[PDB]
Write a protein that binds this ligand. Structure first.
Ligand SMILES: C[n+]1cn([C@@H]2O[C@H](COP(=O)(O)OP(=O)(O)OP(=O)(O)OC[C@H]3O[C@@H](n4cnc5c(=O)[nH]c(N)nc54)[C@H](O)[C@@H]3O)[C@@H](O)[C@H]2O)c2nc(N)[nH]c(=O)c21
Ligand SMILES: Nc1ncnc2c1ncn2[C@@H]1O[C@H](CSCC[C@H](N)C(=O)O)[C@@H](O)[C@H]1O
Ligand SMILES: [Zn+2]
Ligand SMILES: [Zn+2]
Lengths: 291, 120
């Protein structure tokens, strides 16, 4: 049962290249829950981090990480603590949520993510945001605006070249524009944790931002492919991947941060960015506040 | 969230919580318990999880009464000693991580819990 020992499943190119209508998502184990030893979001975030351990993430000193939707109705932030456990000790974590919470982040901002002003560019964006109104399924499942408009503008303006994102989507919480922006990364996928395999949740991953269109993606068709994949792929609830945590921490890659004019970006630079070997952004002092 | 309300009605939140739990009050729940390779050093407070086989590791802010209750921290510098860090709790005390932290002090010389690891 090899896949049970993996942290989850990543959308394969087999389904990326399909051309299908958007259908209802029908999971055989829908809403089935696996017991924890420990909040469920501990297992969920750890498995996301384990999969990102296999991606070409840029990991610099003073790494800039912003974590949206970090709070829970319990006033705590299990995912932010997992990020603290995963990331380098000198990484800067900023988290945010609509509702009050306390966390192990360096900076915690309350309110709509739209109020979060990122003055500089960041290296990694994690979003677990989900709007409760999405559960009011009436009629056609269309592309959603909501917080995705903010996130898309963030990717276009406040994400370092070489930076990455992991953005939670579901069958009904998704964005045409966000899928299309994945084509501006060196690589992309949707990752579904084994801890939450019974949900249509997935983390849309963009790995190494290039600022230019590498893959032309029809976002509406690609979400239809994501649902087609989920409808076609048995996924058993499992946290076996968390049984051995000896290599859980993010590798301390020491990725360099360089300032370059866009006219200076040549094939060597794009190659380094695409391998997780370089970031291009400011090296100012990071300033992230509420507006 | 009852005890969380209670420590807003007192001048000594530490004593208020401890008297409450010591008289049968339900300990604060939802402390953020990590999954760790129990191969750590075992010190009290650490930047990364350091649980031994006899310990559990918690996210620091979640076991801090002053963090959880959104009240002023007593540290003269105003910085919380747990927030942004990890706190190791003896495995037999996971019933009340917050009470254990309010009831004990790390060794000022070896930073292990006095009585639970500190051998000085
Ligand atoms: C996939 N699916 C959907 N429906 C039907 O379509 C609706 C919309 O789905 P929707 O897109 O939420 O996705 P899912 O319910 O996975 O999301 P799931 O609830 O996992 O969503 C997961 C996320 O919800 C979020 N969430 C739960 N707690 C909170 C909270 O307290 N606040 C906020 N804002 N969000 C929360 C959180 O991100 C959590 O991980 C569903 O509600 C069903 O009616 C399905 N029906 C059947 N029979 N079989 C299915 O397989 C099926
Ligand atoms: N527009 C928005 N701005 C900030 N947070 C938002 C938001 N829309 C939804 N959210 C947040 O999305 C979150 C989904 S549940 C988050 C669980 C959390 N990651 C954990 O570790 O437990 C909710 O807290 C909700 O308040
Ligand atoms: Zn505190
Ligand atoms: Zn000592």
């Amino acid at each position: 049962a090899s896949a049970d020992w993996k942290p989850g499943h990543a959308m394969p190119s087999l389904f990326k290249v399909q051309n299908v209508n958007l259908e209802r998502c029908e999971l055989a184990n829908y809403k089935q829950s696996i017991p924890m030893p420990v909040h469920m979001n501990i297992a969920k975030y750890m498995q996301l981090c384990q999969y990102l351990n296999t991606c070409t993430l840029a990991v610099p000193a003073n790494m800039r990480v912003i974590h949206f939707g970090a709070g829970s109705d319990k006033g705590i932030a299990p995912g932010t603590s997992v990020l603290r456990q995963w990331l380098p000790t000198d990484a800067i974590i900023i988290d945010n949520d609509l509702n009050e919470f306390v966390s192990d982040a360096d900076i915690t901002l309350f309110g709509d993510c739209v109020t979060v002003r990122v003055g500089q560019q960041v290296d990694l964006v994690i979003s677990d945001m989900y709007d409760p109104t999405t559960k009011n399924v009436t009629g056609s499942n269309e592309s959603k605006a909501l917080f995705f408009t903010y996130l898309c503008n963030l990717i276009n303006n406040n994400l370092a070249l070489g930076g990455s994102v992991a953005i939670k989507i579901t069958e009904h919480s998704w964005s045409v524009e966000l899928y299309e922006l994945m084509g501006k990364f060196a690589w992309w996928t949707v990752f579904c944790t084994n801890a939450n395999a019974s949900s249509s949740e997935g983390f849309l991953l963009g790995i190494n931002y290039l600022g230019t269109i590498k893959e032309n993606i029809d976002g509406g068709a690609m979400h239809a492919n994501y649902i087609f994949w989920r409808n076609s792929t048995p996924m058993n609830l499992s946290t076996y991947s968390l049984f051995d945590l000896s290599k859980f921490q993010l590798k301390l890659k020491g990725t360099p941060v360089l300032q370059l004019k866009e006219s200076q970006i040549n094939e060597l630079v794009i190659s380094l960015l695409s391998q997780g070997k370089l970031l291009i952004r400011d090296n100012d002092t990071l300033s992230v506040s509420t507006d | 969230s009852s005890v969380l309300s209670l420590v807003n009605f007192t001048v000594d939140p530490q004593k208020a919580y401890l008297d409450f739990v010591n008289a049968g009050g339900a300990p604060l729940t939802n402390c953020v318990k990590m999954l760790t390779p129990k191969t750590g050093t075992g010190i009290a407070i650490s930047v990364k999880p350091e649980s031994t086989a006899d310990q559990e590791t918690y996210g620091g802010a979640s076991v801090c009464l002053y963090c959880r209750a959104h009240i002023e921290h007593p540290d003269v510098s105003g910085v919380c000693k747990y927030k942004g860090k990890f706190v190791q709790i003896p495995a037999q005390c996971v019933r009340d991580p917050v009470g254990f932290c309010l009831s004990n002090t790390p060794c000022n010389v070896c930073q292990y819990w006095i009585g639970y690891g500190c051998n000085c």
